[model samples]
Target: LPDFETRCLSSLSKVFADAELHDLPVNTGSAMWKEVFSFQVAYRSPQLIKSLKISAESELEPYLAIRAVGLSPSELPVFPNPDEGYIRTAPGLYPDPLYPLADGVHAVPNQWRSVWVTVSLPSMSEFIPAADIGAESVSFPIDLCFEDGKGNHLGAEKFALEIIFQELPEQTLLHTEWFHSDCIATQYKVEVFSEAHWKLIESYVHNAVNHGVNMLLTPLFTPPLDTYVGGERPTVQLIDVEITGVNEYRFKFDRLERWVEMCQRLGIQFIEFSHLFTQWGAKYAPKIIAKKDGEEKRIFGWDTEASGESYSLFLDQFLPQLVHFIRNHHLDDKVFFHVSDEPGMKHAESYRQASDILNKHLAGFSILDALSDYDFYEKGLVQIPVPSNDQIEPFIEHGVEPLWTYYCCGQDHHVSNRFFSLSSPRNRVLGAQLYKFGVQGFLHWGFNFWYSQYSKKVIDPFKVTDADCAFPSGDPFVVYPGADGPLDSIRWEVFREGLQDLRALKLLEALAGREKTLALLEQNLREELTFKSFPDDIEWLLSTREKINRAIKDAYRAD
Candidate 1:
């Protein structure tokens, strides 16, 4: 939550059809010592709380505290340093030691007594309580006192607090929702890998060059031609290299040397290193050994099957060696270290914990952070819902910036469209400004995974698929070796087109400010449209784009 919640409500309060405030009872029986109190916030539509407080006797002074709860849409505390904790500035560039109050702690209040909290219909399922107020219901514009250590000393045993719920007018509602949606799109730049077969890289390069596409990402999962086969047989043999079990030193310097050299020659902007580590077969596992002399001395790379053994092994032994290898091979700048490909689908909790650890370890450089789904990105970890954006502020208070690559399942066009729609401008902007804290990169899994004969067709030829098959292209990227004939060529063209758009946008960002660029785009689209013949889909896209442009303008304009 930012000042937008309160500012929007105050500006549109007059248009609110109906507004109400209710006070609920507080349950302090389950209070824990270290547990900073929290209120579960649940509302029907998009509602804003104008004011709130708790009180007992009229004698003692109330203590005001503001704790950072959830990160993205959680309530913004009204105390000292509002713009403090975990404020995402750009992708992969979180400023360290953010001088803001910790999450889940009561701090001093500033202007208003009641901290304004915004509630969206989708987020209304959770119950959120004010720290001092407990769970008591309050009236509109009620004056409640903040409870001190001595508890509410007011004359009344149970206090009556005011809660003002402002139902955002339909117009304002549309704007807010549209803004959020648009933000999602701009934040997460989706990159499709159309070439699962390593041979298709050259074709993709050719297409990109022909289409004026400047940037493309190619991830190599197999070793280079030189290492494909030993010197005895001068033949090409593709070796399946599992990322999880790679020997960092050998893979970087020896096995994948030619592939790295080829990528360097192609001027590819990024190379995502996948399958860095896992708990699969021991065959792929690297030998973790320390040598006192020329021979091996001590080794450690086996699963002991214990509580923290896996984590300890990874953190203590493997990570340092990996970092050292990355630096030694000069791959730190060229390659983006993908900690885990799809951590959410695999060990979810361990992934998050590992991410936090890696963030601390690899503080400055850009690291490819993966999220399984949009929900995981929005709702935090899976098993443990953790705190909302506001709650986890403290742990990440120092601004641990990391690049997030959302690995959305592209089985069908519907899933792709839904993901694209959800990653709209508002959400993208939020991610750009808040979550990523600047420096960010985008990546999707297997642009052409289906090329491997073993892959299955998840989508039809745009005729028999379900409602989910709503994307412009019913296919994920480009199927390999199909009726399309040279699926790589089609994928290459499509990817090149997207890259051109992004490059143009980037140039526009540099030429004019983001706001002006968006305005220019909206104006151009408006000029090109003939309302009668405009396709509904394109119209929707234009409308969404315009709305996002306006939201970005507003967000930036707001001082």
Candidate 2:
């Protein structure tokens, strides 16, 4: 038998075979609500242990879930001469996916692997049972035991979880990591809008909401995002259009109605329509198929000019009806519109024309797009501009109202992103950064982008994580398609942790003064927190969180 040892680790700790393991105490205050643990196993001997089963026992056992950590390959881990502070830059395997442990796990000789342990606390009203009504804190002793396939005891690790009498406020920051409905249909080989597709979409949406994603990227047209200039994604448009006559169109919103109802049921609070114009530039229209003479055809596409009469007529007819449907369903407050994906200065005239058209009809509706240039907002071309973290200083300096931020493959340099090559703290730091900057929202392009670069081909996310070497690994997606539901990734979990961190900070700010809360967050930090700068280590992240949690707990205690 090989010598077996297990140590409790933070979720942020990456379990690589060669790296030294830091055994850390596991504890979470109520302000942060959810705690993810990494129960790491180190096989000291060179013996191939075929299978080991993991089981956990705790009073909060019902709320605890355990999944085996799986490694994903990163052929393009980072850009050449990657900015400093990345965990690794060279291509290699990275710990990311959290797989179901129903069949147990395999252990290679002298290798280290871990199972992700998540403890999500319910509200105090539902949690306090009659027996524990007046308690100020709750202690959960989590005992994790490992056994061989034949039931031979291997090792056990103990973790203590302390939950103070506090709760994280409802997440206020609008968060949407672009839900791709077409990606689900393409990945599962199901027809778009099929019942199977809807089921899978709901599963993925549920997974998103469970992990702090409140806003959903609803596809009005198969989102004009990440497609080559002339290429196309599979059609997953919610609105059905029929060309009734010359420059006249009829719209059916049955699918959209079902989508809104489903999202509302699944706890999604915000709905953002897919970009109306093509990505990168708004010179052309997105692929919109409509029925004419009982035959379906591409009515508007890359061939059609965005602001030209053809597409303008289509939008003039479509927008009014869409607004009516939004009001009919009482979704006006929850709905947001997008003009295009990412327009730059060169595309200013085209974007301006498209924005003007949208502004004419979409008055009182928030229209936002992910662009780095502050000129778009300053010029009043975009209503809600979402700047990338690298270029957000200009927006912040101007004190833009309802500020939002995002980061993708381009934001690999000393920024908070969840790329496979980046550290957990890098992903977790976004919450504090957003809170400090007073950002009202956050957006990312890829939630489940299963296609290779620019919709050239649909690639299995399990096989092609980097979008066919287009982006850094883990930038293209954060969730994996599973047999029945979506699988949570370690990056997704940690990103949610950062959102919880943001909520905790907000809660503390509400209890204490904003200055006190901000001071405590920065007290131990060597540098001020910003989108481009923060401590790289997990210690600083966790220590700062604990301090915030303690402050929140103490404020309530004094009350």
- The TM-score, computed over Cα atoms with residue i paired to residue i, of candidate 2 is 0.96
* CA shift of 175, model 2, Å: 0.6
Q: How many backbone clashes does candidate 1 have?
A: 68
Worst 10 residues of 1 by lDDT: 171-180
Q: Global lDDT for candidate 2?
A: 0.81
RMSD of each: 25.8, 2.0
For all predicted structures, in order, the TM-scores are 0.36, 0.96
Tens-digit lDDT track of model 1 for 1-559:
2121111111001111122323232311111111111122112213232222333232111222221111111111121222222122121211011011221223222221122211111111222433233322223122233332345331112222222121111110000000011111111222222133333444444333333322233222221111111111111111122223322222233434554555567644444454333321111212233333345321222232212444444455445655675687677765544444334444655555545555656655555443334345554532212222222333244343342222222321211111211222211222112211222333333333221111122222112111122221212233223221222222222233222233333433544567665455445444432211122232343243334333332332211
lDDT against the true structure, per candidate, is 0.28, 0.81
Off by over 4 Å in 2: 18-45, 128-131, 556-559
Q: What lDDT score goes with residue 61 in model 2?
A: 83
